[PDB]
Swiss-Prot record, chain D:
Keywords: Ribonucleoprotein, Ribosomal protein, RNA-binding. Belongs to the universal ribosomal protein uS3 family. InterPro entries: KH_dom-like_a/b, KH_sf_prok-type, Ribosomal_S3_C_sf, Ribosomal_uS3_C, Ribosomal_uS3_CS, Ribosomal_uS3_euk/arc. Residues 17-88 form the KH type-2 domain. This is Small ribosomal subunit protein uS3. One of its GO terms (biological process) is translation.
Amino acid sequence: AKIQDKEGIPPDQQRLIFAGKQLEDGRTLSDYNIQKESTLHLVLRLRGGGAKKKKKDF
Amino acid sequence: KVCIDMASLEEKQINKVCREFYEYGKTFIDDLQRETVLPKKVESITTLRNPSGQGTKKWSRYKMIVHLRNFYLEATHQVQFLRNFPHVEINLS
Amino acid sequence: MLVPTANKYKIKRRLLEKKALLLEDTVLGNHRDLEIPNLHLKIFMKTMISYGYVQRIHVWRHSYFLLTPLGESRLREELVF
Amino acid sequence: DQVLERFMKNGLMNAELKEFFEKALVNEGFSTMELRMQETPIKIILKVAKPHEAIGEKKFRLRQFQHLAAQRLEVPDESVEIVVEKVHEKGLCALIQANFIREKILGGVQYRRAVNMALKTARHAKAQGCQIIVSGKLKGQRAKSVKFQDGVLIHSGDAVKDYINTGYATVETKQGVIGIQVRIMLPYDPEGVLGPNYPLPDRITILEPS
RNA sequence: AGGAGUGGAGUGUGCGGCUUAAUUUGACUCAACGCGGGGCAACUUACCGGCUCUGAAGGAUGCCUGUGAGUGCAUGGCAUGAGGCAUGCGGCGGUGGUGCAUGGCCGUUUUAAAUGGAUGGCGUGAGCUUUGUCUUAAGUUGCGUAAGAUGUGAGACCCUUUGACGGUGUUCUACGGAGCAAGGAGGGGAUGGAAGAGAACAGGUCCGUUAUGCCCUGAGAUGAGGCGGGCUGCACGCGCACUACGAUAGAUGGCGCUUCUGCCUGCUGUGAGGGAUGAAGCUGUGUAAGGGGCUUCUGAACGUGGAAUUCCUAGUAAUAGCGGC
Ligand SMILES: [Zn+2]
């Protein structure tokens, strides 16, 4: 029959990194508490590294 | 306490190994040059010959006969010329 | 499916050291020594037959692979320094 | 039981490993194989006719058979030991001649010049007799069989198990598969190497009064 | 010459016909029909109805791709991190077709007894070496003959087991052998099997096989999974079986035990013989069952079967059973 397409993120990689004076990298969007500091969790209780396991609703 | 056990599928080459070891153990620590002869063991299967469903239907039963002899001669460190035989299934416990 | 590249170099290591391999043809389960699914090995060793590295000899639900001279000489320049 | 439950799983492994060696040793005159699964290293003996070509230089080709035979038997890497040998009489093996007639038919020779090249290699080795059969699409689209006998055979009896030697082979031409069967009668030998050390049961010889 | 039956009844399950969304198919005198080791709830499974996947070698040309190719996310933004899309030559898969393109293996004539070289002789030559006769399970032996000897097959051999050989006496013989006795653990191929030259058949199998030529099929695939249905449908014709039609019997007890399919026996004097079909209630296996068991009730057809017709010579036929697959 037919299948569904997808949407991609080209510039959204720069979520909140704010290049400031002294290279003050402003990091927002706190990551999964049960995972590394680099895996920024999805908004509203969803995570990314775990397919759906990490769910931090705050 | 030595205990030699034999077993194999053909018998014309199990009697040789139970006679070639007759003389190379005669003049040694042990004696009573004899070997018990237990009764054999049998395993059977019955099947159809026809490879489809045509003809007269014809059956045939196969057998796996197994002879086996025993040895009981207590000695102390008296061998590897037993391990040089092609078909007999030597056992040494 | 796309066999992950971390698994491809795993397989080309066993072919160098041992120079052989034995693959039970099914889809379920894992390889005994390599802990990789049988379905990754079956997809990947269809490309080492087109190139001309190994040769398969299938017998009784098992396929035995054997390395070849052109294959042994080729894997040197990728895993030997 | 116990003995008749391992003697059938042992033999069920000899039927498969023997099925692989004769495919990876096609062009080397493979004759037989023998498996003894009670040792420290599991012995495996191979009788062939090209020892310095099945092994390969540096034994690169022998250290592959040892790793594939250890994966199958489920043992450590260095717990199995392959030993190569060489046939005594190349001309008396019925499975070596069955493949020599088969490498010719892939070589453009006709099946008459190829069969007779394998009937006189059984005379020179002093065999009592030898029969050959060829059946397929030999020269067209209608199939037939042809026999070629050059001696004395024996078909019924109990000695047939010891005095005959069989061998099959098939060739995959551009038309379709062809069959080949070879049967050889081994000569009586009192020592027991070339042929058996048994006289046939219906031979009576009367001594001399001296 | 005899014994037990089949063909008639009710059930078990194979085949035809009709029907159906589909009721997947092969085999048709012997030599198709409880046969495909074919006792199918799923799987088996080849068929029918929806849904999901690719489990799509590698080159070539155009196009797109680290400034993100794709993939998992029960919800839409993060996570992983290198191939994708379009044409074609090709590799690969198929219980898709042809057994009248083949191999291998089975069946049938054959449970028969038949055949191949070389010497001599006979024919210009192919070619023949015959048509007898006694005995045997047997071209198995013996005689007669322009023929005399040697192989394969039968026998010996093997499962297998006390040197048992028509040996001894007796009655017939063509000197090949046959009957009847004794003695004997065993008697006339010691019993029963296994085996079985060289030819033939358009015999059966491509649905058994990573056996195989050619044709057919290729992503909304004739490939791979998952779920329901079917192969078990029922006016009728046929083949193999199981249970009966009763007193030489049925019911109920006792005796034998780790044995047995027997033995003794208060009731029934005849539809208390027979046990199909259906009802209500209890239970086992399994993901799924009014299929499988048990208890009370219901209780058919059947009164030893028309023309035809099958198997059988002794520890066998027929009766009653227990193992295994
Ligand atoms: Zn997380």
